[PDB]
Amino acid sequence: DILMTQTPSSLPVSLGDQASISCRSSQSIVHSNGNTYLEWYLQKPGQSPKLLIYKVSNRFSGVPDRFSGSGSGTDFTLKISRVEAEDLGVYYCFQGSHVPFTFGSGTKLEIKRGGQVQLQQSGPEDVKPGASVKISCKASGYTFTDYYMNWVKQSPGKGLEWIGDINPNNGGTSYNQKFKGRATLTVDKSSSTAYMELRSLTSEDSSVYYCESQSGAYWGQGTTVTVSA
Amino acid sequence: HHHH
């Protein structure tokens, strides 16, 4: 299991300045096919994470070259030259080279003080412990079966965690063992909808759950599942 | 072999 170490956790900055975030993997994330699936995400409060950099240095369509990714093997860096108000939020690195995919702890980029494709997730769920829940992710604007569908958990407890994914076309799955088979990913071709079933829920399962496709290029608004006795 |  690869551990992603982000540095620093807090990064105060003045507008126009240059920010530099580091990420280190417990072990090489060079995939056998030659690629290094290192990604950088930016999450603004109340929103879903947004893809900025993939494969170490590719800028996602729409991201300004103010954002620059570099690195190799186990060392990676994200540099933001001339920071803008829009850049403020929490940055996360992610490795998608080895299952289970993992995220860094995050970097809070805050200001120094003084002086059409879319994924629609179902409504929030409130369930009792030991119960089971099923949330959906309706896809549109692209060919649902041409891309794997990922599910990500977010809780203040351990930030972002990759649950697993599914190939909507053939049903092939990939799970994060930490969930111990309690999670089941399914799909419905007719309606281009992905589903996630989580059973034997405890308070620890209370979080925001996201579905994400096209290698993190598109996310749902998330679904809040609250487990209370 | 599986990747994101």
Side-chain angles (χ1 to χ4, degrees), chain A, chain B residues 2-4:
Chain A
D1 262 51
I2 303 178
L3 182 277
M4 303 301 289
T5 299
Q6 223 168 308
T7 290
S9 54
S10 178
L11 209 187
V13 65
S14 300
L15 293 186
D17 287 57
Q18 197 194 71
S20 186
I21 309 172
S22 285
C23 182
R24 184 163 304 185
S25 55
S26 73
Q27 46 186 296
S28 177
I29 53 175
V30 177
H31 184 282
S32 57
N33 68 24
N35 289 331
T36 293
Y37 294 95
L38 183 95
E39 299 164 24
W40 288 97
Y41 288 97
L42 166 57
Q43 181 180 46
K44 296 167 174 292
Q47 288 174 48
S48 307
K50 295 168 188 169
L51 184 61
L52 297 178
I53 303 292
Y54 57 106
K55 286 171 190 173
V56 180
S57 56
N58 286 321
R59 306 199 176 78
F60 184 53
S61 202
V63 183
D65 51 20
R66 303 195 287 86
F67 293 97
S68 165
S70 76
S72 181
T74 56
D75 251 69
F76 305 97
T77 297
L78 173 66
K79 291 178 182 172
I80 310 175
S81 62
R82 303 145 73 169
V83 176
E84 276 171 42
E86 288 167 50
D87 309 333
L88 271 26
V90 185
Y91 289 75
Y92 294 93
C93 49
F94 164 98
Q95 71 80 33
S97 289
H98 304 301
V99 173
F101 309 142
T102 51
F103 300 80
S105 56
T107 296
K108 172 86 170 299
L109 195 279
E110 52 174 281
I111 197 71
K112 284 178 177 175
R113 310 208 204 172
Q116 185 40 44
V117 26
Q118 91 172 72
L119 266 39
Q120 273 183 168
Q121 292 181 254
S122 51
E125 293 281 327
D126 290 302
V127 301
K128 322 277 287 183
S132 181
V133 66
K134 182 176 185 175
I135 57 185
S136 63
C137 175
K138 213 285 212 306
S140 61
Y142 72 102
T143 301
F144 180 55
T145 55
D146 285 332
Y147 303 94
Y148 278 73
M149 183 58 78
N150 291 283
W151 291 83
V152 177
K153 172 187 180 184
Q154 182 179 53
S155 62
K158 46 267 284 58
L160 295 170
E161 301 187 82
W162 179 78
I163 300 166
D165 62 41
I166 180 171
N167 180 315
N169 189 237
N170 62 31
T173 57
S174 186
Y175 292 94
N176 183 327
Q177 296 302 294
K178 288 191 176 181
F179 290 97
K180 307 176 180 54
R182 297 193 295 121
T184 306
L185 305 186
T186 58
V187 116
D188 183 74
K189 294 191 171 182
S190 177
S191 63
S192 291
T193 304
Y195 305 91
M196 187 206 86
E197 290 165 286
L198 226 202
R199 53 186 199 288
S200 304
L201 301 176
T202 67
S203 57
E204 294 186 65
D205 296 306
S206 299
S207 299
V208 169
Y209 291 82
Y210 296 100
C211 55
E212 153 273 293
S213 192
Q214 294 202 202
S215 305
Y218 297 101
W219 296 60
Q221 357 68 270
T223 292
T224 300
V225 173
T226 305
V227 184
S228 178
Chain B
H2 186 58
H3 61 72
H4 194 231

mmCIF file of all heavy atoms in Angstrom, chain A residues 31 39 96 165, chain B, unseen atoms left out:
data_model
loop_
_atom_site.group_PDB
_atom_site.id
_atom_site.type_symbol
_atom_site.label_atom_id
_atom_site.label_comp_id
_atom_site.label_asym_id
_atom_site.label_seq_id
_atom_site.Cartn_x
_atom_site.Cartn_y
_atom_site.Cartn_z
ATOM 1 N N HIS A 31 4.238 3.124 -13.159
ATOM 2 C CA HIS A 31 3.436 1.972 -13.546
ATOM 3 C C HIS A 31 4.232 1.160 -14.557
ATOM 4 O O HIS A 31 5.136 1.684 -15.206
ATOM 5 C CB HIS A 31 2.116 2.458 -14.141
ATOM 6 C CG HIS A 31 1.162 1.363 -14.495
ATOM 7 N ND1 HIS A 31 1.291 0.601 -15.636
ATOM 8 C CD2 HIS A 31 0.029 0.938 -13.883
ATOM 9 C CE1 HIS A 31 0.276 -0.240 -15.716
ATOM 10 N NE2 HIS A 31 -0.505 -0.055 -14.665
ATOM 11 N N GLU A 39 -1.534 12.573 -9.858
ATOM 12 C CA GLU A 39 -2.487 13.639 -10.142
ATOM 13 C C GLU A 39 -2.595 14.699 -9.036
ATOM 14 O O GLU A 39 -2.372 14.413 -7.858
ATOM 15 C CB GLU A 39 -3.862 13.017 -10.390
ATOM 16 C CG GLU A 39 -3.903 12.056 -11.573
ATOM 17 C CD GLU A 39 -5.137 11.160 -11.574
ATOM 18 O OE1 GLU A 39 -6.161 11.536 -10.967
ATOM 19 O OE2 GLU A 39 -5.090 10.078 -12.196
ATOM 20 N N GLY A 96 -2.588 6.914 -8.952
ATOM 21 C CA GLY A 96 -3.516 5.963 -9.524
ATOM 22 C C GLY A 96 -2.752 4.909 -10.293
ATOM 23 O O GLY A 96 -3.255 4.357 -11.276
ATOM 24 N N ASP A 165 -13.488 0.877 -8.165
ATOM 25 C CA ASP A 165 -14.030 1.312 -9.446
ATOM 26 C C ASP A 165 -14.694 0.169 -10.184
ATOM 27 O O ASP A 165 -14.615 -0.987 -9.773
ATOM 28 C CB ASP A 165 -12.940 1.923 -10.336
ATOM 29 C CG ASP A 165 -11.841 0.934 -10.700
ATOM 30 O OD1 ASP A 165 -12.137 -0.242 -10.991
ATOM 31 O OD2 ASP A 165 -10.666 1.344 -10.716
ATOM 32 N N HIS B 1 -1.825 -4.434 -12.397
ATOM 33 C CA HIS B 1 -1.689 -3.732 -13.705
ATOM 34 C C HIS B 1 -2.722 -2.606 -13.871
ATOM 35 O O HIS B 1 -2.497 -1.652 -14.613
ATOM 36 C CB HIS B 1 -1.823 -4.743 -14.849
ATOM 37 N N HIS B 2 -3.847 -2.714 -13.171
ATOM 38 C CA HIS B 2 -4.912 -1.714 -13.259
ATOM 39 C C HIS B 2 -4.510 -0.320 -12.767
ATOM 40 O O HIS B 2 -3.871 -0.183 -11.722
ATOM 41 C CB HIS B 2 -6.139 -2.189 -12.476
ATOM 42 C CG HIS B 2 -7.329 -1.296 -12.629
ATOM 43 N ND1 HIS B 2 -7.890 -1.012 -13.855
ATOM 44 C CD2 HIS B 2 -8.045 -0.597 -11.718
ATOM 45 C CE1 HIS B 2 -8.898 -0.173 -13.693
ATOM 46 N NE2 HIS B 2 -9.013 0.095 -12.405
ATOM 47 N N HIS B 3 -4.894 0.714 -13.516
ATOM 48 C CA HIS B 3 -4.568 2.090 -13.129
ATOM 49 C C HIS B 3 -5.758 3.037 -13.295
ATOM 50 O O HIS B 3 -6.766 2.684 -13.910
ATOM 51 C CB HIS B 3 -3.372 2.604 -13.941
ATOM 52 C CG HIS B 3 -3.620 2.644 -15.413
ATOM 53 N ND1 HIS B 3 -4.455 3.569 -16.001
ATOM 54 C CD2 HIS B 3 -3.191 1.836 -16.410
ATOM 55 C CE1 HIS B 3 -4.533 3.328 -17.297
ATOM 56 N NE2 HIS B 3 -3.776 2.281 -17.572
ATOM 57 N N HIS B 4 -5.633 4.242 -12.745
ATOM 58 C CA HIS B 4 -6.699 5.238 -12.811
ATOM 59 C C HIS B 4 -6.847 5.815 -14.230
ATOM 60 O O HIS B 4 -5.901 5.672 -15.034
ATOM 61 C CB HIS B 4 -6.395 6.360 -11.811
ATOM 62 C CG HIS B 4 -7.549 7.277 -11.541
ATOM 63 N ND1 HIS B 4 -7.440 8.649 -11.613
ATOM 64 C CD2 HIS B 4 -8.821 7.021 -11.151
ATOM 65 C CE1 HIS B 4 -8.593 9.199 -11.278
ATOM 66 N NE2 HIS B 4 -9.448 8.232 -10.993
#
